[PDB]
Specification:
2 copies of one chain form a homodimer. With about 260 residues, chain A is mainly alpha-helical. Chain A has 11 helices and 4 strands. The first copy, chain A, has one domain. Helices cover about 65% and strands about 5% of the residues of chain A. Chain B: Its main location: nucleus.
């Protein structure tokens, strides 16, 4: 019971660091999406006129419309990498690792985390954008010219299945830590200390899901099985990006993403 | 007394759990064995034989020495922030403060604590590095090319003054809590509970210094006066960073390494 006690202290610390690191939580996203009075309605982009109306109404942090939208999603990923790096530093043992292994774990982990957390902002019909101020429809994203028309479809397909697990922010905080502390990332110098941390995080996630979802049979196993889909999302994203880069020689990538993508293939 | 003696013991126990290299362990290492870095030749031997924590992994980013020692120290500060952050959550009332205020208190607190605890690792002749495995001489640090040659000198000048107070870990544990619970940090939302907790910590520190150092006249006042010096060190360190970011180096930190370093200040 003292062993399980330490796992609860870890869960609490991770949930705390997650709230401090990520300004748009699943709790806030669901409040925006479902019309709760705690939060404000998003402007909906579903076509070219609504996009233009949106460009004026929303002041986006992040050229032909399909290229601008894709680049907008990539610049948001740059921001997500910054937030995920701040979160990773909070995971006990992470900053104690060899600096080069910290880089390797972030390199191979950040997109898996990005698309995990993106599901929090999605329903079957679209995705929250611009810190939840906007909502871009799935059908509008599907309507973009080749090779941009399908770029978000694998993320939506994953999200609909992932969201069926009904995880909250406290569950996701531990799950994203598990994804980062993967001892099987290519070119790790010291695997053992990473595996030891992941063992502790897996114990913490199992206990969290048992306490938080006591009527959800094998929720832990079903969540771990979702890491299969996550890997395929990232592989397919990197492959599509290789095509986009070559068809659109005028489209720039941030060096942070370029350096990550370079080794992903 | 009961509340104040419980607070003193609780903070001591938490400090021992949070900080691997205590003043007791550091003074034991310093008074009798670490590898001594007194020049370029000894540094090169040490890196080859022991692979120093932050400095040696940075060989992948630079062929220069001074920038790797300085940036190595910066990455030790990144790691100290997480030890201090884990410690802060054990201070009674801290985790019940507004989450934004917790972030604000650590943002302005961590650097004063880093230089407080660095004194524990210092004598007038040098500093323990790499988890106590190395001792880098004050004269070697002074020999580094401008503007790196001066970066530790203000920390040494403070450490010699601070170390003359002859505080131990049980005293330091309460003092670092006092630093964190400062109601005068900019942008705090709810100052009342911060000042309420600091009042209790100040009472606990005053009693701890009276019981632990009964013959040390006005030790409490003289320790609180050192907070002036800590603020000055942090200010001078940020000033030096601005000079360093106009200095030519071969160091091009991996973008993910730059991300890990970002948000230290």
């Amino acid at each position: 019971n003292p062993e399980s006690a330490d796992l609860r202290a870890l869960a609490k610390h991770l949930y705390d660091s997650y709230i401090k690191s990520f300004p748009l939580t699943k709790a806030k996203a669901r409040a925006i999406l479902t019309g709760k009075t705690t939060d404000k309605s998003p402007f909906v982009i579903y076509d070219m006129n609504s996009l233009m109306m949106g460009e004026d109404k929303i002041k986006f942090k992040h050229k032909e419309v399909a290229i601008r939208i894709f680049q907008g999603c990539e610049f948001r990923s740059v921001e997500a990498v910054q937030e995920i790096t701040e979160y990773a530093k909070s995971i006990p043992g992470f900053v104690n690792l060899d600096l080069n292994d910290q880089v390797t774990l972030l390199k191979y982990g950040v997109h898996e985390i990005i698309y995990t957390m993106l599901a929090s902002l999605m329903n079957k019909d679209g995705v929250l954008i611009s810190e939840g101020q906007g909502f871009m429809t799935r059908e509008f994203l599907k309507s973009l010219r080749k090779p941009f028309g399908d770029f978000m479809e694998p993320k939506f397909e994953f999200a609909v299945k992932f969201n069926a697990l009904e995880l909250d922010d406290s569950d996701l905080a531990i799950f994203i830590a598990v994804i980062i502390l993967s001892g099987d990332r290519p070119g790790l110098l010291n695997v053992k200390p990473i595996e030891d941390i992941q063992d502790n995080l897996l114990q913490a996630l199992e206990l969290q899901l048992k306490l938080n979802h006591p009527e959800s049979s094998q929720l832990f196993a079903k969540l771990l099985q979702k890491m299969t889909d996550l890997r395929q999302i990232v592989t397919e994203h990197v492959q599509l990006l290789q095509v986009i880069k070559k068809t659109e020689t005028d489209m720039s990538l941030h060096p942070l993403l370029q350096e990550i993508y370079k080794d992903l293939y």
